[PDB]
Amino acid sequence: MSHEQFRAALQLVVDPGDPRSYLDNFIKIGEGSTGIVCIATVRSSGKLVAVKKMDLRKQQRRELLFNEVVIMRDYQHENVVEMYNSYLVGDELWVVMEFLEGGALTDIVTHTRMNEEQIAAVCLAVLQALSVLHAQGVIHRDIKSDSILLTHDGRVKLSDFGFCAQVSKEVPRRKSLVGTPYWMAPELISRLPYGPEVDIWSLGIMVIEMVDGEPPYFNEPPLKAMKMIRDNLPPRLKNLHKVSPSLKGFLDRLLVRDPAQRATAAELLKHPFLAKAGPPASIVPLMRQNR
Numbered sequence: 513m514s515h516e517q518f519r520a521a522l523q524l525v526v527d528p529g530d531p532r533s534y535l536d537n538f539i540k541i542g543e544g545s546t547g548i549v550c551i552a553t554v555r556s557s558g559k560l561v562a563v564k565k566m567d568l569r570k571q572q573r574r575e576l577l578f579n580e581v582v583i584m585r586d587y588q589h590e591n592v593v594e595m596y597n598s599y600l601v602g603d604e605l606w607v608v609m610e611f612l613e614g615g616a617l618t619d620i621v622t623h624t625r626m627n628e629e630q631i632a633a634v635c636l637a638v639l640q641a642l643s644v645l646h647a648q649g650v651i652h653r654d655i656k657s658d659s660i661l662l663t664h665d666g667r668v669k670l671s672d673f674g675f676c677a678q679v680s681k682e683v684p685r686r687k688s689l690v691g692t693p694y695w696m697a698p699e700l701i702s703r704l705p706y707g708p709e710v711d712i713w714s715l716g717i718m719v720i721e722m723v724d725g726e727p728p729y730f731n732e733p734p735l736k737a738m739k740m741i742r743d744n745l746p747p748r749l750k751n752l753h754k755v756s757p758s759l760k761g762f763l764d765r766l767l768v769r770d771p772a773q774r775a776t777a778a779e780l781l782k783h784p785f786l787a788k789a790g791p792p793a794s795i796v797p798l799m800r801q802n803r
């Protein structure tokens with residue numbers, strides 16, 4: 513999708529006008545791969561929202577950015593980040609979304625050591641989001657700690673649907689090589705027709721992140737790690753004994769090369785390990801401003 517097609521397509525789906533007519537005090541607080549993030553106040557309520565600003569020109573695979581707004585608009589799930597509106601301002605796409613104070617899960621996995629109560633909490637939240645998404649034919653395709661955001665009270669939400677896809681009876685499988693190298697499913701790296709199961713394998717890699725602090729082969733070049741995930745046996749935990757038999761069995765249902773034998777999200781929700789999931793409050797102590 514080209515710069516012109518991207519803008520033309522967006523004009524048909526975005527909300528009309530400029531959000532500056534109702535949002536005040538824009539302050540940049542960060543960035544992402546496709547743009548920046550500002551916080552702003554809803555003039556009428558004083559409520560805080562996050563605004564993602566993305567240049568229409570300086571982008572890659574704009575079609576995926578377009579699907580992210582089309583597919584995820586009107587989407588509502590307690591474990592999925594909320595999108596309120598979208599607008600075209602100048603040569604930029606502005607997406608007004610929910611502001612989550614807890615930050616991403618990556619900050620936590622690289623600065624502390626989560627316990628099985630915390631991990632099961634994140635897994636349960638992500639799995640609740642995936643079971644609903646997959647049932648509707650939506651595949652996230654970029655599951656990793658960076659894509660998990662936390663609320664101030666410790667609630668877990670799936671974010672960054674920039675690589676998502678929608679499969680249907682018409683087209684039941686995808687073949688695009690998308691995501692982040694270290695978290696990509698083997699059948700996906702292999703360019704084979706794949707389905708929702710790719711998210712389950714990625715989640716498995718995210719579990720290794722929560723346990724060891726990084727995904728497998730993180731010390732290897734991205735293309736090299738991909739070959740190893742694609743051709744070698746499932747990656748293993750360095751701290752294999754640091755986990756309970758419950759978590760080992762859980763992880764063994766995610767990291768299965770043959771997607772047909774890999775567990776689905778709906779099934780995993782019934783897995784024993786998740787019974788150890790603590791409450792939202794158990795996650796709070798992990799956050800930076802609380803460490």
Ligand SMILES: Cc1nc(Nc2n[nH]c3c2CN(C(=O)N[C@H](CN(C)C)c2ccccc2)C3(C)C)c2sccc2n1
Pocket residue numbers: 541542543544545546547548549562563564565593609610611612613614615616658659661671672
């Ligand atoms: C920047 C930032 N955002 C925070 N919280 C948020 N609330 N709502 C959102 C965020 C970050 N968001 C987001 O989309 N980030 C991604 C990146 N991934 C890694 C999370 C992104 C941004 C721009 C372009 C592509 C991708 C949304 C949902 C708006 C928070 S909390 C404490 C510090 C902090 N710093």
